[PDB]
Write a protein that binds this ligand. Structure first.
Ligand SMILES: CCCCCCCCCCCCCCCCCC(=O)OC[C@H](COP(=O)([O-])OCC(O)COP(=O)([O-])OC[C@@H](COC(=O)CCCCCCCCCCCCCCCCC)OC(=O)CCCCCCCCCCCCCCCCC)OC(=O)CCCCCCCCCCCCCCCCC
Ligand SMILES: CCCCCCCCCCCCCCCCCC(=O)OC[C@H](COP(=O)([O-])OCC(O)COP(=O)([O-])OC[C@@H](COC(=O)CCCCCCCCCCCCCCCCC)OC(=O)CCCCCCCCCCCCCCCCC)OC(=O)CCCCCCCCCCCCCCCCC
Ligand SMILES: CCCCCCCCCCCCCCCCCC(=O)OC[C@H](COP(=O)([O-])OCC(O)COP(=O)([O-])OC[C@@H](COC(=O)CCCCCCCCCCCCCCCCC)OC(=O)CCCCCCCCCCCCCCCCC)OC(=O)CCCCCCCCCCCCCCCCC
Ligand SMILES: CCCCCCCCCCCCCCCCC[C@@H](O)O[C@H](CO[C@H](O)CCCCCCCCCCCCCCC)COP(=O)(O)OCC[N+](C)(C)C
Ligand SMILES: CCCCCCCCCCCCCCCCC[C@@H](O)O[C@H](CO[C@H](O)CCCCCCCCCCCCCCC)COP(=O)(O)OCC[N+](C)(C)C
Ligand SMILES: CCCCCCCCCCCCCCCCC[C@@H](O)O[C@H](CO[C@H](O)CCCCCCCCCCCCCCC)COP(=O)(O)OCC[N+](C)(C)C
Ligand SMILES: CCCCCCCC/C=C\CCCCCCCC(=O)OC[C@H](COP(=O)(O)OCCN)OC(=O)CCCCCCC/C=C\CCCCCCCC
Ligand SMILES: CCCCCCCC/C=C\CCCCCCCC(=O)O[C@H](COC(=O)CCCCCCC/C=C/CCCCCCCC)COP(=O)(O)OCCN
Lengths: 121, 57, 70, 53, 140, 56, 107, 347, 459, 42
């Protein structure tokens, strides 16, 4: 799936306009919470490296870390969801446009299919 | 004599871990022992270029 | 008392398992279909995927060129 | 990798020198202007795989 | 190039023992010469004569290993009357390992070579039978 | 003494709060797997006069 | 040989400290007697009293989700039915043959 | 040097890389490579000593030879098709020479010999820049023409790079040579997935860049270039040694750390194209990288080595210059495995 | 499933925010409460499973292992309380953090609805164990031990990953439920043979198999007491769980492929039981006993019969508890004597009678005295193997005899005879150690009352 | 050394965090509204 050459793709657009037709991630998304947790860990490590009280050295600095991580994580999640939606849309369109390559398998019940039986002895 | 020393302490140790250590140590000594002479490295590069031109086409 | 205060009935787990099985089955079929679609698109190239660039024809100059035969 | 800044901005930094049949000075034609023009027109928007085939 | 591979693969496994031995000897000589060239480029031992002596030793060792492996593998496949069996390649590989050990004059190395070569030859035969691709072409 | 032992024993509320939050999260995950509720061939059941969902 | 015969400046290896000399009734938990006693008490109360007894009682009185009594009663009613009508107890075929479509060999 | 001059040189290096990345003409790509090479040398020779000058001249020789080979490949491609655009290579071994030139620029085997030498000669900051930023342009060029490579040659060179890095890292006591061999192995991992998925190549490059940045900046913070010099860090900054060991475990590919994400993904991608033997061999070879990482971790944090009496004075002083991005780099190189599907962002 | 996972995660901030002298109390109390919470998972059904969500599911194979994993942490803390007394508060907190991370990884591993998640956590358990072994070990061999314990594992587990992703490319899924419901026979092919080997050897290296068991004595002898307990009690059972979960897709190729491993295990139980007879080290003896028991469990899993699976589940649980107790007893001896050699400290029953009683009970339960669950698992495996082939009974009888011999040898050498004259630093046993042994042994004799709780999903 | 809490830096950090949070909330509201409008929900 190389979608760099996908037709009608603006080069340096992070989020295209059609991406606005997709539901945005909730602000309580677990991935957003993980990004905020990553920011908090970055703040704790920053306090530790500089030899400061790890938990209660800079509250403004840790808040900025968490906020920036949440911001970037929200936008990254939007882009990821859009990209996966594009992949699914292309796959479904290709399947619809090539009926001869994806035939409907005949439904066959297990009562009429002969499977070899291997005893456990 | 057999279960503890001969097999467990010697041969089962000789096969998997000791042979691996010996082979890796020998290969590391062979690869890393370069005298830092760009003449040898350049000759090797020329040999590799000729080999790839004569092999991958 | 234990069943009343701590656990629920079997229908809850039964139907949750049915929903989970449905989701996982659909995911597996989608994975196989995506693999087949990727193979076809890379082999043939008529799909939106694997579209390598080609020289734009808007760069060509269509004018007399000081010689009648171009 | 490739960041198509030129297409986004419409700058034409280096595209004028890519092909023989693109606005030479004094309208001087290349030796294979017709062949390159035909080959480029054949493969426009088709894509590398289908163009090669 | 792939000419030697084609020459070796075209001959049927259970027939033309001498031709298979010749192809294996040629492949062994080629790889031995390549290894000798790499060693000379990386390490000039003492002089031209010592370098050519080392080249000859390596090339004849590799050619002998290839020869022994081919004859044993082909003879075993012919006598056992069961072609396309990795066991013959194992035995051929084992024989090749033994001759390398005899050349270097060490029971351990000879023993070690026999076990490893036998495994590699069996794996190669298995991959030929099952179509395993070392260098897979881009599929999807 | 209140407001003094709290600053020393406030860590003891962490695990029970985690347990309660985990129970809530388990119920929240339960809420998203209701596609087959009251649709199993084994438990197709007509709803009671004052029942909306067979299970929550 | 003017070497001091000392490889480095090393602290001497300390002797093991016995918790019974500085505190009889030591419980082997801590050097601080109060922390020691309360560690013993919490370990005993939450290990033996809470988990080992209440958890054992909870496991003992677990409701029958394995359906052992249910399976027993089902079997009793089924065998009562089959003895009454004379059907030959359990059949050899788990699934009825009329709903199975065998492949004809014609060999 | 003058801070203005250093800033100008760094911006010129970045501008050369950007010119390589944004251009569609082969001549402009060559020009960007030339600009990057021109501005790179004084950065390698910031601290003036014979070792730095030797490393700089070796680097210049290798890069100039690679640039000439690249121009030769461009000229042959132009000869067999009057095309300057960066697209399918349109020809045989002209493509082979392009691949060889880009491999020499990247340091792939068998053109790997200059990497340990140049990394050892130059300082830690120059090594950081060399091993991090100098990979973007050749990898971008390779990704653009990834539909043209001969898979046999690229896969052979990638496997050779992995093997050589793994074997060469085992014999090293100097930290910079360890970093160089790690870079060689990671480049080998990167280029073995180029024929199948360039997105995996870019993901691996991002992860490796983050990990290498964290590693080099930790080494700069605790100013040690040798194993025994690094063994003294526990007696002043134990937290630095602990973070260093966690980063080393991440670089070894151990789950659930971040360094597991690329290889995993690559292996998965490689099994989608019926390639089974080579991913297995790659993992067995990466075990060697893990071994020498583990030896460094043993010497660094998991054991307490003897110290010196003078270290007491160092207890009374604090680092005046601090790296702001070090905590973020450590966290990113350690704890972003759960965010793996975000690789759909075509990073 | 989160009602167990979240409190385990909260164990970390509580540990790091605790007072300098209240870390052990808080950790022990809250770990015991978490174990009480985890006891609720034992209510399983004869139907499919307890599928909590798309990510985590429970089973009557998973539930006993989860309960044992949760119950082991307080005992590990109680045993580590002794030798970490002279440690700084930060390093004690780091040790507790390693233990908590190990417990969380094991909890998430045992549920693991998907195979790649199972692999990720199954390897994630490696890092805390390696750090614990190589940082808080006493001797100079610990580093070497760690290397072994690492590389062996990876040597088996990196191929497995490959196989796993390969399967997901063909089947289309790695979910356990879909894998079981859509299972298809494996054709007898070389490719399928190597897929079988890749799927199997990763778990067979962790049991460990007789040929691949060299890392275990090193890791057990060199690790601290908590590391030894977690290695012998739970970490050995990960391979058994993995084989039990993954043998479904390997049929019918298991019939042919199982012969080398069956031979290796059936002869290696005898070999290791004989090795235990001539041992100058207590920890090495206990480690080799663990190897023998897991060889029997390997035989049970390979035979692949319902009685085999029930017996294997019971034996894993019983061996975990018993081996942890034995390691604790040996550690209590070592903390007084500082030598870890069986022959030096003798006649200890005269000096420490209650500890001698604990030794006797532990040896009796290791010797598989009925009606202990050790004997239940042993007997079920023996019956299934006899049905497999009547000649196995000779090897199993030999193993039973040698097991009794070396168990009573270890008991008699240390507890009976005449005390060493010059050893005078043997203080009376503390309340902590006696409580540790009681908390080890009481669950075994309670579980013998309700065996069906540990007999697995085939009960 | 001997330094007071730099109120300029503290104010800048607090303002940056508050501005980022406000912008994120506004952007989320706009995206939700835009998605509803495009898909014809409300
Ligand atoms: C994604 C891919 C990223 C790959 C890796 C990225 C490369 C990072 C290195 C770039 C700069 C090198 C550097 O700062 O040192 C390494 C640095 C460590 O700093 P250091 O070792 O303490 O400083 C030692 C210097 O060598 C001591 O040098 P100095 O103090 O004398 O330098 C003076 C200083 C101050 O510059 C000035 O004085 C400004 C004056 C303006 C002059 C106008 C010139 C116009 C012509 O200028 C600089 O430091 C260079 C900045 C150049 C601007 C770049 C645009 O580590 C990093 O910066 C890593 C950052 C992480 C990646 C970038 C951000 C994430 C994306
Ligand atoms: C699985 C997912 C779930 C778990 C996630 C795991 C990761 C999470 C955390 C990630 C890292 C972030 C923080 C680490 C920064 C390091 C700072 C530090 O050292 O700690 C000192 C600090 C206390 O010491 P201090 O008095 O401030 O000053 C002493 C100096 O800092 C230092 O004193 P010193 O220098 O004198 O002591 C020297 C010592 C100091 O050296 C260190 O301690 C280094 C710190 C560890 C390395 C961090 C690596 C980066 C993260 C990787 C995590 C790997 C996880 C994967 C599993 C593999 C494990 C390797 O180093 C040594 O002793 C040398 C030998 C060390 C042995 C071998 C090293 C192994 C380290 C591997 C640890 C990995 C897990 C770390 C967990 C957190 C540890 C703090 O600890 C803390 O207080 C912070 C802990 C977290 C704060 C919790 C606050 C939340 C509670 C309130 C809100 C409630 C939440 C729930 C809301 C709802 C309730 C109502
Ligand atoms: C026999 C029926 C008894 C029923 C009455 C209830 C008894 C409840 C006891 C529960 C288990 C005890 C807990 C283990 C730790 C020991 C406690 C302790 O610290 O002692 C201090 C305490 C005070 O002594 P001290 O003077 O302060 O200390 C002096 C030194 O310690 C010097 O110490 P020492 O020299 O005085 O040694 C202490 C003594 C006791 O210490 C032990 O060694 C206890 C270990 C016993 C078994 C060892 C593991 C083998 C696996 C069997 C598992 C079955 C468990 C059944 C359910 C258990 C429920 C928790 O050692 C022995 O006498 C050797 C016993 C070997 C028995 C072999 C026969 C096995 C099968 C027996 C039948 C079981 C099922 C029958 C089903 C059919 C009929 C209904 O001593 C005692 O209280 C002795 C306990 C009474 C003797 C128990 C022996 C058989 C009981 C087996 C389990 C209960 C059967 C259930 C119904 C059967 C009808
Ligand atoms: C000191 C000397 C002795 C003094 C004391 C004298 C008194 C002796 C009596 C004690 C033992 C004698 C035997 C008497 C047996 C009576 C109790 C028995 O009948 O109850 C068992 C019940 O016991 C439990 O089933 C077993 C205990 C639970 C085990 C869980 C362990 C606790 C958790 C702690 C952590 C676990 C760590 C290990 C991980 C797995 C069997 O119950 P069951 O026949 O079925 O049905 C119960 C009733 N129903 C029908 C309503 C359901
Ligand atoms: C290693 C951990 C990840 C860290 C990543 C860096 C974090 C700081 C970056 C700060 C913001 C950078 C975003 C750039 C803003 C606009 C970008 C936009 O203009 O570019 C688009 C592209 O967007 C960017 O490429 C995506 C960047 C997102 C990178 C994050 C992915 C990380 C992988 C999963 C690990 C989880 C990390 C989570 C913690 C950070 C258009 O690209 P296009 O011209 O059309 O094609 C070129 C690329 N091709 C050739 C591959 C197709
Ligand atoms: C170190 C401590 C123990 C470690 C683990 C040991 C366990 C792994 C051992 C693997 C089990 C055997 C591997 C293959 C078994 C297949 C059955 C075969 O052996 O029997 C004959 C096979 O004949 C020969 O054995 C052919 C193979 C000969 C080459 C293999 C090397 C023999 C010894 C090597 C052992 C070294 C193992 C360790 C490697 C590092 C049957 O003849 P055939 O009907 O035709 O083949 C049937 C299979 N088909 C249908 C797929 C074709
Ligand atoms: C393709 C190539 C595959 C490569 C497989 C790598 C296996 C991982 C182990 C690599 C170790 C290699 C290094 C080595 O052993 O050197 C010898 C080394 C020298 O010690 P140093 O501390 O480095 O220095 C001493 C002087 N002061 O000896 C040792 O200490 C080794 C001790 C630990 C041994 C680890 C056990 C590894 C073997 C177990 C099985 C794994 C093998 C992997 C393949 C198995 C085959 C399927
Ligand atoms: C404790 C240390 C032991 C180390 C573990 C060793 C056992 C694992 C087996 C070796 C690695 C094999 C990994 C296979 C991954 C599964 C994928 C698979 O099975 O697919 C097969 C792939 O099969 C292979 O490619 C196998 C080639 C093996 C190459 C590497 C060999 C490594 C050494 C093997 C010798 C040792 C054998 C016994 C080891 C037992 C452990 C001592 C089919 O390939 P396709 O081409 O896609 O199918 C289409 C055509 N039918």
């Amino acid at each position: 799936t190389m979608m760099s050459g996908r037709p009608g793709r603006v080069p340096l657009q992070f989020l295209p306009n059609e991406a606005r037709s997709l539901p945005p991630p909730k602000l309580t998304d677990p991935r957003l919470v993980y990004m905020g947790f990553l920011g908090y860990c970055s703040g704790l490590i920053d306090n530790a490296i500089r030899r400061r009280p790890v938990v209660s050295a800079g509250l403004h600095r840790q808040l900025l870390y968490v906020t920036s991580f949440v911001f970037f994580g929200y936008y990254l999640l939007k882009r990821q969801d859009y990209m996966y939606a594009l992949r699914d849309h292309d796959m479904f369109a290709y399947v619809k446009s090539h009926p001869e390559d994806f035939p409907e398998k005949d439904k066959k019940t297990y009562g009429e299919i002969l499977e070899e039986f291997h005893p456990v002895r | 004599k057999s279960a503890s020393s001969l097999l467990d302490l010697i041969w089962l140790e000789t096969i998997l871990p000791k042979t691996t250590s010996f082979i890796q140590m020998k290969m590391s000594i062979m690869v890393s022992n370069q005298k830092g002479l760009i003449k040898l490295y350049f000759l090797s590069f020329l040999i590799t270029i000729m080999i790839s031109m004569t092999l991958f086409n | 008392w234990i069943a009343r205060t701590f656990y629920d009935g079997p229908e809850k787990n039964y139907e949750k398992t049915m929903a989970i099985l449905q989701i996982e089955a659909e995911k597996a079929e989608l994975r196989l279909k995506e693999l087949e679609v990727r193979r076809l698109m890379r082999a043939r190239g008529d799909g939106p995927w694997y579209q390598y660039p080609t020289i734009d024809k808007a760069l060509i100059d269509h004018s007399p060129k000081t010689t009648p035969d171009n | 990798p490739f960041f198509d800044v030129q297409k986004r901005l419409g700058l034409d930094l280096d595209r004028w020198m890519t092909i023989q049949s693109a606005e030479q000075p004094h309208k001087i034609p290349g030796r294979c202007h017709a062949f390159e023009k035909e080959w480029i027109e054949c493969a426009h928007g088709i894509g590398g795989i289908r163009a090669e085939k | 190039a792939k000419t030697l591979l084609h020459k070796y693969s075209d001959i049927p496994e259970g027939t033309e023992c001498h031709r298979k031995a010749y192809a294996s000897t040629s492949i062994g000589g080629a790889t031995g010469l390549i290894v000798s060239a790499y060693s000379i480029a990386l390490k000039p031992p003492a002089s031209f004569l010592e370098g050519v002596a080392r080249t000859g030793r390596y090339t004849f060792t590799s050619a002998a290993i290839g020869a022994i492996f081919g004859l044993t593998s082909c003879i075993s496949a012919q006598v056992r009357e069961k072609p396309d069996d990795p066991l013959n390649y194992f035995i051929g590989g084992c024989a090749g390992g033994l001759t390398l050990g005899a050349r270097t004059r060490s029971y351990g190395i000879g023993a070690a070579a026999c076990a490893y070569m036998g495994l590699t030859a069996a794996l190669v035969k298995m991959g030929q039978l099952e179509g395993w691709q070392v260098f897979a072409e881009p599929k999807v | 003494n209140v407001l003094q032992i709290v600053r020393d024993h406030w860590v003891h509320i962490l695990v029970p709060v985690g347990f309660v939050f985990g129970c809530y999260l388990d119920r929240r995950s339960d809420e998203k797997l209701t596609a087959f509720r009251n649709k199993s061939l084994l438990f197709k059941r007509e709803l009671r006069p004052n029942e909306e969902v067979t299970w929550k | 040989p003017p070497e001091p015969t000392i490889r480095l400046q090393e602290d001497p290896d300390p002797e093991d400290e016995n918790l019974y000399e500085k505190n009889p009734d030591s419980h082997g938990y801590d050097k601080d007697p109060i922390v020691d006693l309360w560690n013993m008490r919490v370990v005993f109360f939450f290990g033996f009293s809470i988990v080992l007894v209440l958890g054992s009682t909870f496991v003992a009185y677990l409701p029958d989700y394995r359906m052992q009594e249910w399976a027993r009663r089902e079997a009793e009613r089924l065998v009562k039915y089959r003895e009454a009508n004379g059907l030959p107890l359990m059949e050899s075929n788990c699934f009825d043959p009329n709903k199975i479509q065998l492949p004809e060999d014609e060999d | 040097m003058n801070p203005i001059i250093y800033t100008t040189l760094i911006m010129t290096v970045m501008s050369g890389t950007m010119l390589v990345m944004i251009s569609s003409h082969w001549l402009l790509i060559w020009i960007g490579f030339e600009m990057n090479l021109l501005a790179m040398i004084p950065v390698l020779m910031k601290n003036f000593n014979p070792r730095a000058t030797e490393a700089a001249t070796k680097y210049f020789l290798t890069q100039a030879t690679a640039s000439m080979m690249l121009m030769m490949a461009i000229i042959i491609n132009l000869l067999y098709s009057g095309q300057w655009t960066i697209t399918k290579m349109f020809n045989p071994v002209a493509m082979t020479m392009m691949t060889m030139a880009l491999a020499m620029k990247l340091g792939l085997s068998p053109f790997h010999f200059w990497v340990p030498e140049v990394t050892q000669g130059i300082s830690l900051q120059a090594g950081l820049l060399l091993l991090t930023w100098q990979k973007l342009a050749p990898l971008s060029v390779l990704c653009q023409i990834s539909q043209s490579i001969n898979p046999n040659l690229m896969l052979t060179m990638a496997m050779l790079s992995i093997l050589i890095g793994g074997w060469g890292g085992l014999n090293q006591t100097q930290l910079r040579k360890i970093m160089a061999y790690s870079s060689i192995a990671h480049m080998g991992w990167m280029t073995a997935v180029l024929p199948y998925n360039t997105t995996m190549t870019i993901l691996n490059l991002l992860i490796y860049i983050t990990m290498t940045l964290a590693m080099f900046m930790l080494l700069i913070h605790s100013s040690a270039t040798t194993t025994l010099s690094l063994s003294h860090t526990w007696n002043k900054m134990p937290v630095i040694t602990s973070l260093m060991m966690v980063t080393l475990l991440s670089m070894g590919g151990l789950p659930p750390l971040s360094g597991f994400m690329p290889k995993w993904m690559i292996i998965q991608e490689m099994t989608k194209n019926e390639s089974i033997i080579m991913p297995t061999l790659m993992a067995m070879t990466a075990l060697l990288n893990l071994y020498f990482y583990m030896r460094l971790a043993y010497s660094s944090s998991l054991t307490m080595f003897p110290s010196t009496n003078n270290m007491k004075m160092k207890w009374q002083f604090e680092h005046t210059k601090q790296m702001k991005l070090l905590p973020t780099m450590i966290v990113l190189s350690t704890l972003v495995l759960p965010m793996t599907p975000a690789l759909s962002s075509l990073n | 499933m989160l009602k167990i996972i979240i409190p385990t995660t909260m164990l970390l901030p509580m540990t790091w925010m605790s007072k300098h002298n209240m870390i052990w109390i808080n950790a022990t109390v809250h770990s015991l409460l978490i174990s009480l919470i985890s006891l609720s998972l034992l209510n399983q059904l004869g139907e499919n499973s307890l599928n909590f969500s798309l990510t985590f599911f429970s089973d009557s194979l998973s539930a006993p292992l989860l309960v044992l994993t949760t119950w082991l942490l307080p005992l590990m803390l109680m045993a580590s309380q002794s030798h970490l007394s002279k440690e700084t508060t930060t390093r004690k907190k780091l040790y507790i953090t390693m233990l908590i991370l190990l417990q969380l990884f094991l909890i998430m591993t045992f549920t693991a609805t998907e195979l790649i998640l199972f692999y990720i956590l199954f390897e994630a358990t490696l890092v805390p164990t390696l750090i614990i072994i190589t940082r808080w070990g006493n001797q100079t061999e610990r580093l070497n031990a760690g290397l072994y314990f690492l590389f062996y594992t990876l040597a088996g587990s990196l191929p497995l990953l490959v196989a796993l992703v390969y399967i997901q490319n063909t089947t289309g899924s790695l979910n356990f439920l879909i894998i079981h419901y859509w299972s298809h026979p494996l054709s007898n092919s070389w490719s399928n043979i190597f897929m079988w080997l890749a799927c199997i050897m990763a778990f067979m290296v962790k049991m460990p198999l007789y040929g691949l068991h060299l890392w275990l004595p090193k890791a057990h002898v060199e690790a601290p007491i908590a590391g030894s307990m977690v290695l012998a009690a739970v970490l050995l059972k990960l391979g058994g769980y993995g084989m039990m979960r993954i043998t479904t897709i390997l049929n019918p190729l298991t019939n042919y492929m199982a012969y080398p491993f069956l031979m290796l295990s059936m002869w290696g139980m005898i070999m290791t039981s004989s090795i235990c007879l001539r041992q100058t080290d207590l920890k090495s003896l206990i480690a080799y006993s663990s190897v023998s028991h897991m060889a029997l469990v390997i035989v049970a899993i390979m035979i692949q019969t319902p009685w085999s699976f029930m017996g294997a589940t019971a034996l894993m649980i019983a061996h975990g508890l018993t081996s942890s107790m034995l390691f604790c007893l040996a550690n209590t001896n070592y903390e007084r004597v500082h030598s870890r050699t069986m022959i030096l400290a003798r006649g200890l029953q005269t000096l420490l009678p209650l500890m001698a009683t604990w030794w006797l009970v532990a040896s009796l339960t290791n010797l598989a005295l009925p009606p202990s669950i050790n004997l239940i698992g042993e007997l079920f495996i023996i019956t299934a193997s006899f049905s497999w082939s009547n000649i196995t009974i000779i090897l199993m009888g030999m193993n039973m005899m040698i097991t009794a011999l070396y168990s009573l040898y270890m008991l008699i050498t240390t507890q009976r005879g005449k005390y060493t004259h010059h050893i005078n630093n043997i203080k009376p046993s503390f309340t902590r150690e006696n409580a540790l042994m009681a908390l080890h042994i009481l669950p075994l004799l309670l579980l013998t009352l309700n065996p069906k709780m540990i007999l697995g999903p085939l009960y | 050394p001997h330094g007071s809490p730099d109120w300029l830096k503290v104010g800048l950090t607090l303002g940056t965090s508050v501005f980022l949070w406000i912008y994120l909330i506004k952007q989320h509201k706009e995206d939700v509204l835009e998605y509803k409008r495009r898909n014809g929900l409300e």
